[PDB]
Design a protein around this ligand. Structure first.
Ligand SMILES: *[C@@H]1O[C@H](CO[C@@H]2O[C@@H](C)[C@@H](O[C@@H]3O[C@H](CO)[C@H](O)[C@H](O)[C@H]3O[C@@H]3O[C@@H](C)[C@@H](O)[C@@H](O)[C@@H]3O)[C@@H](O)[C@@H]2O)[C@@H](O[C@@H]2O[C@H](CO)[C@@H](O[C@@H]3O[C@H](CO)[C@@H](O)[C@H](O)[C@@H]3O)[C@H](O)[C@H]2NC(C)=O)[C@H](O)[C@H]1NC(C)=O
Ligand SMILES: *[C@@H]1O[C@H](CO)[C@@H](O[C@@H]2O[C@H](CO)[C@@H](O[C@@H]3O[C@H](CO[C@H]4O[C@H](CO)[C@@H](O)[C@H](O)[C@@H]4O)[C@@H](O)[C@H](O[C@H]4O[C@H](CO)[C@@H](O)[C@H](O)[C@@H]4O)[C@@H]3O)[C@H](O)[C@H]2NC(C)=O)[C@H](O)[C@H]1NC(C)=O
Ligand SMILES: *[C@@H]1O[C@H](CO)[C@@H](O[C@@H]2O[C@H](CO)[C@@H](O[C@@H]3O[C@H](CO[C@H]4O[C@H](CO)[C@@H](O)[C@H](O)[C@@H]4O)[C@@H](O)[C@H](O[C@H]4O[C@H](CO)[C@@H](O)[C@H](O)[C@@H]4O)[C@@H]3O)[C@H](O)[C@H]2NC(C)=O)[C@H](O)[C@H]1NC(C)=O
Ligand SMILES: *[C@@H]1O[C@H](CO)[C@@H](O[C@@H]2O[C@H](CO)[C@@H](O[C@@H]3O[C@H](CO[C@H]4O[C@H](CO)[C@@H](O)[C@H](O)[C@@H]4O)[C@@H](O)[C@H](O[C@H]4O[C@H](CO)[C@@H](O)[C@H](O)[C@@H]4O)[C@@H]3O)[C@H](O)[C@H]2NC(C)=O)[C@H](O)[C@H]1NC(C)=O
Ligand SMILES: *[C@@H]1O[C@H](CO)[C@@H](O[C@@H]2O[C@H](CO)[C@@H](O[C@@H]3O[C@H](CO)[C@@H](O)[C@H](O)[C@@H]3O)[C@H](O)[C@H]2NC(C)=O)[C@H](O[C@@H]2O[C@@H](C)[C@@H](O)[C@@H](O)[C@@H]2O)[C@H]1NC(C)=O
Ligand SMILES: *[C@@H]1O[C@H](CO)[C@@H](O[C@@H]2O[C@H](CO)[C@@H](O[C@@H]3O[C@H](CO)[C@@H](O)[C@H](O)[C@@H]3O)[C@H](O)[C@H]2NC(C)=O)[C@H](O)[C@H]1NC(C)=O
Ligand SMILES: *[C@@H]1O[C@H](CO)[C@@H](O[C@@H]2O[C@H](CO)[C@@H](O[C@@H]3O[C@H](CO)[C@@H](O)[C@H](O)[C@@H]3O)[C@H](O)[C@H]2NC(C)=O)[C@H](O)[C@H]1NC(C)=O
Ligand SMILES: *[C@@H]1O[C@H](CO)[C@@H](O[C@@H]2O[C@H](CO)[C@@H](O[C@@H]3O[C@H](CO)[C@@H](O)[C@H](O)[C@@H]3O)[C@H](O)[C@H]2NC(C)=O)[C@H](O)[C@H]1NC(C)=O
Ligand SMILES: *[C@@H]1O[C@H](CO)[C@@H](O)[C@H](O)[C@H]1NC(C)=O
Ligand SMILES: *[C@@H]1O[C@H](CO)[C@@H](O)[C@H](O)[C@H]1NC(C)=O
Ligand SMILES: *[C@@H]1O[C@H](CO)[C@@H](O)[C@H](O)[C@H]1NC(C)=O
Lengths: 216, 322, 135
């Protein structure tokens, strides 16, 4: 819903397409208006030159007018070619975004919107496209004491996936992008060497899930 | 560039003659203004990518990793890192063209603001990794951040927790080596120097073209006016105007092409900043050679410099696999 | 070279107000009164040709804008790290653009910040795809 408002409230939301259209219109208007320039001739109307002056000097007058108009056309065509190259680059970028952002999930940062991209929706517009990027953004953050590893029986334990956090006294393991504390066990942690080399290791107990079944 | 002043030097007759050619001067002025706006926009996109201005902690204890060569140095008058100062010094008269209506214009963002943006990005990546590049900045020890980055490239984090000292020593040695290579190599910044030289040469040719007769009796408008009557002065001034206008059109077309190329380069640089500095990129050979770990941005005159830190296997042994 | 340079008019939206400021590029404020000859309509142009509110920027000389020691987001780019806006009695003011808001992450060697919630953010990106095929 907000997106709709973001287009209704803001007049310059579609600035790119409007600017491109205005630039093209201005170029065309200048090109058509250039026909009114004498370019050093007595008049800018071919009929006036033909009627007023005899062929002898009408030839040079028409030559001057032709040279001026040809120069204007060449300038306009060069500008149009440059603009077309720029628009081709923009269209290639848009096609790449559609191929990657819309038809799949892109891990590229800041490519398909801001934040952790989730999905893109395409929409059309006069001589343009609009991508609605829906992304996942962390909202509330809390800071906890953390350790790089944990020693239980002289062996360093590292998380299988996630991070060790401490809410003061107790210790837990939680996923990086969301606070979901879990009891530290051997299932979500793996052992690698002893616990006398890792810097900052913190003593704790790893709960083995097998013991309850063995006891019972 | 002032089209009227450039083609016609304070000559009322020359201005009157040029007025009959249309509105080419307006076209050239609009093109130059668009080029300047494009340059400003490119700089903004390349650098202005982070809102908050993060600052490093007063105490720099990152588990042995040293960032002195890349962090700003408050001791010097300019708050720039040693590498940034070296880059500024190693790159080097344009004002000597302020004689034929050729303004140089001021950059919108001063070098101080660019340095501040680079320092803020460095602080954000060092103290928050890629979290600040996707939302609220989240603090994390640099050792754990490097463990995460190692895990990203398919290497268990235990290797870092076992060889942190060696990794930090290698990082410091590589920083020193790259600084020494930049100091001792004058061709490292070839691209920026070449761009500056091309712009200066184009401007020099444009200004020098005013000395060409273009078929006229003399290259000085005042001399033609004084030494000839209006009937012939008209044609002489017309020829001079035609030649100067052709030169200006050629210069403007070349400037437009160069501006398009620089816009493409700036877009590439902005993409690299977004995908490497603000996060870890899995693309091969994009953020430097080898398994990309991270990147550091630095500012150079009209350009950016990325120091890509990557993980490379060193020693291999033969084994039998099934 | 005697002086020369461009003259630009900084004006906000006509819906807001009509007062404007005049910027003379790369020229000292001392020569501005004679650089325009003061031979214009008695009010307005002479008002913008001189006055107490005259600022000397690296980009040139600005008249009709009040210099303020504060810093806000750039609104009208003047140049050399200086911008202008209409923020106040509303008038035209000139300041130095601020590169965002200051921040300082409470970085520690044994503390990590983890999210506790999330948000679904929807953003729009507009890209031209083609132009008119004029012949
Ligand atoms: C890894 O191997 C490559 C391939 O060449 C090697 O050549 C020998 C050394 C082979 O040795 C076998 O190693 C196995 C375990 O790695 C195996 O378990 C055995 O221990 C051993 O063979 C067995 O034992 C021996 C005693 C014997 O009984 C055999 O019958 C058994 O089967 C093996 O590693 C491998 O094939 C090395 O690269 C180079 O590969 C060349 C062939 O492509 C090989 O042959 C030539 O060597 C001359 C020496 O001057 C070169 O000039 C020439 O260009 C060509 O290379 C090379 O010897 C070999 N090594 C070198 C230095 O060129 C590679 O070096 C080796 N090590 C690493 C770290 O990659
Ligand atoms: C950091 O995080 C840890 C882990 O969450 C906190 O320690 C736990 O805190 C919670 C809530 O304060 C405690 O929950 C308690 O549970 C009791 C029942 O648990 C049984 O088992 C424990 C052993 O795990 C026995 O000690 C206990 O006596 C019980 O036999 C409840 O009785 C407590 O009061 C009420 O809550 C329960 C909730 O179900 C009710 O059912 C009860 O009937 C009762 O009305 C209490 O809820 C928990 O015991 C604490 N320990 C553990 C291991 O989880 C730290 O407090 C926290 N620190 C900080 C600074 O935030
Ligand atoms: C992170 O990295 C930075 C920079 O690499 C370290 O800061 C210093 O870096 C320099 C690099 O060599 C060293 O300090 C400098 O030493 C110069 C001479 O080398 C010897 O000097 C010390 C003291 O005399 C010897 O004990 C030691 O053996 C060194 O080999 C001095 O000349 C420097 O003084 C001034 O002059 C030089 C002239 O070139 C300048 O370049 C310098 O910048 C400086 O203005 C300077 O003392 C040393 O390695 C580092 N420490 C110190 C105290 O200088 C950080 O120490 C390192 N670790 C962090 C930041 O935690
Ligand atoms: C994986 O790869 C890394 C390197 O990429 C290996 O670590 C390197 O190991 C070598 C050899 O063990 C180290 O080189 C040695 O360093 C010794 C320590 O000297 C200190 O002071 C010098 C002063 O210049 C420093 O350069 C040096 O880094 C140390 O800080 C030196 O004493 C050695 O020289 C002499 O060593 C013996 C005596 O011990 C003599 O008998 C020899 O003849 C030799 O002359 C030698 O230079 C190197 O420093 C290590 N790298 C780093 C970054 O420190 C890992 O070992 C390797 N791992 C595996 C499993 O292969
Ligand atoms: C978790 O993070 C919060 C803030 O993100 C910590 O509280 C304190 O918040 C301040 C807010 O800016 C941080 O900066 C301070 O700003 C004030 C001005 O408002 C300055 O005067 C002050 O010097 C700081 O720069 C501050 O860094 C941050 N931590 C502090 C003040 O220690 C919070 O810290 C917890 O509360 C404080 C009061 C202490 O008791 C800490 O020991 C304690 O941890 C952070 N908590 C943890 C566990 O990381
Ligand atoms: C993170 O930073 C803190 C400081 O901000 C580090 O705390 C420091 O830890 C060392 C090692 O435990 C302490 O050394 C001391 O040595 C004496 C003599 O051997 C011993 O008696 C002390 O008990 C202590 O171990 C040091 O004093 C301590 N500093 C402070 C200010 O408390 C910490 O090691 C760093 N790393 C981690 C993972 O926390
Ligand atoms: C985490 O737990 C381990 C083991 O439970 C602790 O190791 C203990 O470290 C202390 C010294 O800090 C040792 O005390 C001394 O040990 C030496 C060598 O064994 C001995 O000769 C001395 O007489 C004295 O006892 C202790 O033995 C050692 N082991 C145990 C079981 O205590 C480690 O200190 C703990 N870490 C923290 C931060 O508490
Ligand atoms: C994570 O954030 C979401 C929102 O981003 C939280 O859910 C939202 O919580 C607020 C506060 O309770 C709700 O507002 C309330 O709405 C009721 C009417 O339903 C009103 O009577 C209350 O006065 C209050 O305004 C809100 O409806 C709810 N949902 C949404 C979509 O905003 C959620 O609680 C957060 N989780 C944690 C663990 O904090
Ligand atoms: C300004 O007011 C007029 C009439 O009220 C109208 O143009 C519009 O409502 C406003 N905005 C612009 C851009 O004119
Ligand atoms: C002109 O302005 C410059 C600053 O751009 C200043 O250094 C110089 O002193 C000024 N000169 C006069 C005569 O005001
Ligand atoms: C701005 O600060 C300067 C000191 O550098 C001071 O002289 C001047 O009065 C201040 N102006 C305002 C509007 O605060």
């Amino acid at each position: 819903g907000k997106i709709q408002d973001s287009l209704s409230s803001t007049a310059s939301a579609l600035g790119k397409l409007q600017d491109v259209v205005n630039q093209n219109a201005q170029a065309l208007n200048t090109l058509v208006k250039q026909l009114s320039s004498n370019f050093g001739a007595i008049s800018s109307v071919l009929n006036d030159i033909l009627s007023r002056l005899d062929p002898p000097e009408a030839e040079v007058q028409i030559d001057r007018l032709i040279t001026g108009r040809l120069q204007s056309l060449q300038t306009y065509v060069t500008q149009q070619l440059i603009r077309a190259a720029e628009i081709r680059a923009s269209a290639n970028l848009a096609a790449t975004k559609m191929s990657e952002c819309v038809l799949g999930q892109s891990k590229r940062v800041d490519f398909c919107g801001k934040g952790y991209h989730l999905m893109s929706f395409p929409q059309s517009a006069p001589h343009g496209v609009v991508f609605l990027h829906v992304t996942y953004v962390p909202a509330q953050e809390k800071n906890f004491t953390t350790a790089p590893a944990i020693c239980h029986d002289g062996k360093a334990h590292f998380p299988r996936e996630g991070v060790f956090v401490s809410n003061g006294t107790h210790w837990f393991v939680t996923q990086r992008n969301f606070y979901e504390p879990q009891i530290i066990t051997t299932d979500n942690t793996f052992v690698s060497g002893n616990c006398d080399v890792v810097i900052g290791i913190v003593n704790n107990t790893v709960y083995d899930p097998l013991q309850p079944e063995l006891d019972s | 560039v002032d089209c009227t002043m450039y083609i016609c030097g304070d000559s009322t007759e020359c201005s009157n003659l040029l007025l009959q050619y249309g509105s080419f001067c307006t076209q050239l002025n609009r093109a130059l203004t668009g080029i300047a706006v494009e340059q400003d926009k490119n700089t903004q996109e390349v650098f202005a990518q982070v809102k908050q201005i993060y600052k490093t902690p007063p105490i720099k204890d990152f588990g042995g990793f040293n960032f002195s060569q890349i962090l700003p140095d408050p001791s010097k008058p300019s708050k720039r890192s040693f590498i940034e100062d070296l880059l500024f010094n190693k790159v080097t008269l344009i004002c000597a063209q302020k004689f034929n209506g050729l303004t140089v214009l001021p950059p919108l963002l001063t070098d101080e603001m660019i340095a501040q943006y680079t320092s803020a990005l460095l602080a954000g990546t060092i103290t928050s990794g890629w979290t600040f590049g996707a939302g609220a900045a989240l603090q994390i020890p640099f050792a754990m951040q490097m463990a995460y980055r190692f895990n990203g490239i398919g290497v268990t984090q235990n290797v870092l927790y076992e060889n942190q000292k060696l990794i930090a020593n290698q990082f410091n040695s590589a920083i020193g080596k790259i600084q020494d290579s930049l100091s001792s190599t004058a061709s490292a910044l070839g691209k920026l120097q070449d761009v500056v030289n091309q712009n200066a040469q184009a401007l020099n040719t444009l200004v020098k073209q005013l000395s060409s007769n273009f078929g006229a009796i003399s290259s000085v408008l005042n001399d033609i006016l004084s030494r000839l009557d209006p009937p012939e002065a008209e044609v002489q001034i017309d020829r001079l105007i035609t030649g100067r206008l052709q030169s200006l059109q050629t210069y403007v077309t070349q400037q437009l092409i160069r501006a398009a190329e620089i816009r493409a380069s700036a877009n590439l640089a902005a993409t690299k900043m977004s995908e490497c500095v603000l996060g870890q990129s899995k693309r091969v050979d994009f953020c430097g050679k080898g398994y990309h770990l991270m990147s550091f941005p630095q500012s150079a005159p009209h350009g950016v410099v990325f120091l890509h830190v990557t993980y490379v296997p060193a020693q291999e042994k033969n084994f039998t696999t099934a | 070279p005697c002086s020369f340079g461009g003259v630009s008019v900084i004006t906000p939206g006509t819906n807001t107000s009509n007062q404007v400021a005049v910027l003379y590029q790369d020229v000292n404020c001392t020569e501005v009164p004679v650089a325009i000859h003061a031979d214009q309509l008695t009010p307005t142009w002479r008002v913008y040709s001189t006055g107490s509110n005259v600022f000397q920027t690296r980009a040139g000389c600005l008249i009709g804008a009040e210099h303020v020691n504060n810093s806000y987001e750039c609104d009208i780019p003047i140049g050399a790290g200086i911008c202008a806006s209409y923020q106040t009695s509303q008038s035209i003011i000139a300041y130095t653009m601020s590169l965002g808001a200051e921040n300082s992450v409470a970085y520690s060697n044994n503390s990590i910040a983890i999210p506790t919630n999330f948000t679904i953010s929807v953003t729009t990106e507009i890209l031209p795809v083609s132009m008119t095929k004029t012949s």
